[PDB]
Structure 1
Amino acid sequence: AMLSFEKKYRVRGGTLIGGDLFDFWVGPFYVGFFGVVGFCFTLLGVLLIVWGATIGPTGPTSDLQTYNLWRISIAPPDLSYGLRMAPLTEGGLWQIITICAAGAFISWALREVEICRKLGIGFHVPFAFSFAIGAYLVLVFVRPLLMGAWGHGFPYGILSHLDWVSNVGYQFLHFHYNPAHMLAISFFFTNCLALSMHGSLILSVTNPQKGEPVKTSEHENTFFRDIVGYSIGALAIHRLGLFLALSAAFWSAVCILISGPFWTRGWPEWWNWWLELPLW
């Protein structure tokens, strides 16, 4: 099927590393050379993981082994097997899944590109997505490497993956003082503010007061030019945004790549270089 006006954009080709073969759609999705692969991993994961759900802790029999998202979780191998394929049962499986998921985001990521091409548009989207992609590597790869352990990454638990942070986080006591985590946090906030403004304003100009005209920038560019005094501008908002977020991510990315392989003391301490300044 197609959108009211989609029927007129589905050109031929535009693919990246080949794909002029499966260069077609299905439902509302373009396949290509990446919609294809990503799929593979998807089931050889979304389901490969099912095996895990099946297996569980001890075994598929252990009263420990359950089928409640809230609990189900695939655990990485022991730090034992450092940078080596662990026994699926003991770790590998986890690795396997993770193996896939990597590509599934590398495909869909690229697939995005082929699209970005077809629809002869800008590529800000994927490029952005990549960061988000990366932050997933430098948080289950770039780090665990400089820790010589694959099993040294994190789990795949609906909420189980929560603790994994709880710990590695306290491993430095007041993780909160991590310089990055502070900023990286700040962003994931600022973003959730500007956003709660743009997406608001707009939905307040195009659908303004009763019996009123679809307001124009000649308002917007003043809306805040009144409350706060200044207005970043309209084009801008759609900049500051990506900015914030595409940074917040990359930040946090740092945030946990350095926590450990680049710093072992409790963060609170790091903050000492400050104090000790030959001045105060």
Structure 2
Amino acid sequence: AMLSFEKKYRVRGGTLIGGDLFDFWVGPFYVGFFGVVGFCFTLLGVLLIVWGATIGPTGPTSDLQTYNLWRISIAPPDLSYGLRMAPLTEGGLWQIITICAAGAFISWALREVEICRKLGIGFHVPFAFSFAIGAYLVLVFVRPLLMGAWGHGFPYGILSHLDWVSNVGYQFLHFHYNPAHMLAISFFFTNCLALSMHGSLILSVTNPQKGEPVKTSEHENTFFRDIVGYSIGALAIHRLGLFLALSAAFWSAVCILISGPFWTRGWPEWWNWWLELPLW
């Protein structure tokens, strides 16, 4: 099915790979060669997460086995396996599922790429997506690699990965002091501010008090200039927000990349370079 103005754009071609082979639509989703690959990676991935939930950490009859949505969890192998493929039932499963997830995300990105090529729009979205894909990779590929073992990756489970984040973070005593962490947090927050401000503005102008007509560019600028003496302007706010969100992901990726591989001591201690300068 199509939007009421969609048929006029459903052109043929634009692939990266496949050409007319998978060059078709299904419902509202565009397929394409990377969608077929993606669907394969995804389906096998999920279906395997399903088998992991089915077997549990000690076998299907054990009390630790579970189908409870909050507790199902597939965790990596022990560190003793280093960068080798570990047995299926000993964190292997997690490795394969990971390969599938990474491949599905990279496929997804490439499919948005074929979609940009079709619609004749910029490739800002899949580029931006690639930052989340990057973040995911440090959290499953880069970091555990620099650390001589895939087991350093986080488990795939709704709360178990929360536990992972918790203990890895606390290995450094007071993570809040991580300076890249402080940055990333600031960007996630600022992102949240710009988003709330943009949202508010558009909705405040395109829908004004009853009795008033759709507002204008002049209104837009006059308001944020009235309140805080500046208006970065319409275009740019779309530019900033993209900066904030992509940067937030960036600094998260670097804030965790340095936690181990480039820093092993507690994090507040890092700030020592500041209490010890020869100024004081």
- Output the TM-score relative to the length of structure 1: 0.99
CA distance in 2, matches of 1:134, 1:40: 21
CA distance in 2, matches of 1:100, 1:20: 26
CA distance in 2, matches of 1:22, 1:193: 42
Judging by fraction of residues, say which structure has more helix.
Answer: 2
CA distance in 1, matches of 2:25, 2:17: 18
Flag structure 2 segments of 5+ consecutive residues without an equivalent.
none
RMSD of aligned alpha carbons: 0.7
1:178-229, CA deviations, whole angstroms, 9 ceiling, x for partnerless residues? Answer: 0000010000000000100101110110011112110001100111100111
CA distance in 1, matches of 2:49, 2:19: 29
Misfit runs of 4+, over 3 Å: none
1:64 deviation in Å? 1.1
1:19-70, CA deviations, whole angstroms, 9 ceiling, x for partnerless residues? Answer: 3310000010111111110100111011111000001111111011111111
Indicate the residue corresponding to 1:266 in structure 2: 266
Q: Secondary structure at the match of 2:33?
A: coil
CA distance in 1, matches of 2:224, 2:276: 43
Indicate the residue corresponding to 1:195 in structure 2: 195
CA distance in 2, matches of 1:88, 1:60: 15
1:82-140, CA deviations, whole angstroms, 9 ceiling, x for partnerless residues? Answer: 00111111111000000100010000100000000100001110000001110000111
1:160 deviation in Å? 1.2
My pick for the range that moved more, 12-21 or 254-263, is 12-21
1:18 deviation in Å? 2.9
CA distance in 2, matches of 1:200, 1:37: 40
CA distance in 2, matches of 1:73, 1:48: 12
Q: Secondary structure at the match of 2:122?
A: coil
Flag structure 1 segments of 5+ consecutive residues without an equivalent.
none
CA distance in 1, matches of 2:119, 2:199: 25
- Output the TM-score relative to the length of structure 2: 0.99
Aligned 1:1-80 pairs, distance under 5 A: 1-80=1-80
Q: Secondary structure at the match of 2:228?
A: coil
1:17 deviation in Å? 2.4
CA distance in 1, matches of 2:20, 2:48: 30
CA distance in 1, matches of 2:244, 2:213: 32
